[PDB]
Amino acid sequence: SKIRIGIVGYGNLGRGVEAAIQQNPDMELVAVFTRRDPKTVAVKSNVKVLHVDDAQSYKDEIDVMILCGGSATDLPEQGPYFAQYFNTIDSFDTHARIPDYFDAVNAAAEQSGKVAIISVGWDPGLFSLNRLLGEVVLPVGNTYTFWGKGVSLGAIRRIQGVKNAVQYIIPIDEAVNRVRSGENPELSTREKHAMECFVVLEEGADPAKVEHEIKTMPFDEYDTTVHFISEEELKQNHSGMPNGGFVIRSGKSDEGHKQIIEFSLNLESNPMFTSSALVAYARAAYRLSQNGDKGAKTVFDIPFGLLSPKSPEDLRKELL
């Protein structure tokens, strides 16, 4: 029988999860839960939509609940809540709150007997794994993480004179080059990334005051370029959510040999990629739960074989 998935939240990440489930035929989307009145949600696949207050009564209809809410307000409540009733996966990405979030989810999952895998995605998630791998295989060395080029995700739009805007984070090619050369550079924040902002001015706003306001936002840490454009220009050309980056470990053998590991992503859709990772880890959470594991997990606790619908024997024959 298919592994039965529920989604909580139908923003960009929830839509991406629904999309990813189409690519994973051992799973089936059984329900979408929303804080909105569910009669007002149009889900592409037309599975049932329910209010989050009804989720508990679906305890036995769902194998893994994928929490697709944002980390700022949704997940801090939702993670420990849903971990009482369901194996859960989420993309929790507030670094400072990671340890408190893990402990809250853990307490809940340990008492329920469910498996919760937190902080899945590409950073945290796939990049975290690469940072780890780098430092255990090359214990003497440095790690560098670069983000973008990519849309970054607001307070720009509270700035007076800005009608709309889209902001990019961009790694500085020279810094990436120095890292890839094995120089093991001491790089400041400003040396690693540049920011680019595209802004649609409100009618009769002052371009120069708007520019200076953005650059000195409490952006002040980076070299930032502002571009003023039309509303048609932002709709047509800045609606996409590309992203990417690099994790590089630059190390040395005990005899001085330079060894370099690099992991990189080039994504046309950030949310669709994050979602696809959430669905792979939902497979692992199901497998762990069926083997009688429980409690909160991160990517550091999941062996990669659990992520695959293939048997362990077939993985050994095909991929190893």
Place this chain on the structure above:
Amino acid sequence: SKIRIGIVGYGNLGRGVEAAIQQNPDMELVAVFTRRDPKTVAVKSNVKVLHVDDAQSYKDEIDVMILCGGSATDLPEQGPYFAQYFNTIDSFDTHARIPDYFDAVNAAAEQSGKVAIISVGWDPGLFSLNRLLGEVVLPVGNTYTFWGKGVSLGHSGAIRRIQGVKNAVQYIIPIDEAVNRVRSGENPELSTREKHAMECFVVLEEGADPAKVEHEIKTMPNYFDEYDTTVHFISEEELKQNHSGMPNGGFVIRSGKSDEGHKQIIEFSLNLESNPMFTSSALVAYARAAYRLSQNGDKGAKTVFDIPFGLLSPKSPEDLRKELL
């Protein structure tokens, strides 16, 4: 306290494991086991050297034995042998033979209650992980693996048997145009000859015929006849200055699509000045995991697919979440 390591075999990989122990202060090397007469092995770290027939008697002195032998003849006997007495790690790398090796090691480790992790290294090992990660995160897509620039070890020796050759070094090299086609997300169908080229650096004997030597290499069946091959003739001096290293590297790339058609590309690469030093560095990190799994009650043969990355680190689980997550 310290995790007690033993090394079987004191070639390039054994020497590398010794070196990596220097960078892992939670471990200590206890013994080096060899098939040679042990009085005749000079070990850099000055640890005791023993004959392999004696290893069973050090069962209680060693937490993990790292098997540093080759896959062609050493490991097929040594993996199932040592797994009867010791948690083990090896770099078994004959991909078409992994299932049989796994079964034999698993039969042995399951009975002894020991943990054996097989096929650790760059490929198999870290490239395998990344092949797997790609296909689970991007299930609609194609995977490509490229090797090099690096030495193919069958190959340098096959050239050396050619009449006229004093010495030689061969490299496999990914073809840049093919790598960039994969990176663009075209999903190309790549022939053997499109994916990698071969480069040989050859020191000729007095009065060998260059053209005969070139010709013999490029047409060598089962080695170079599948590939575009360049042969360079050089001096003994340049072979030493420039070609005594064991560099390697490569790429694993997954090129896939979201359900709405977005191109998503994942790439993993290695650029190594020393292949044996890198592999052995992996072997030591996986020895930490084998020790952890042993202490928790596990047993049997495992591959990298069975090892969660947190077990590779000497840091606590909480400290990993704090620092890296």
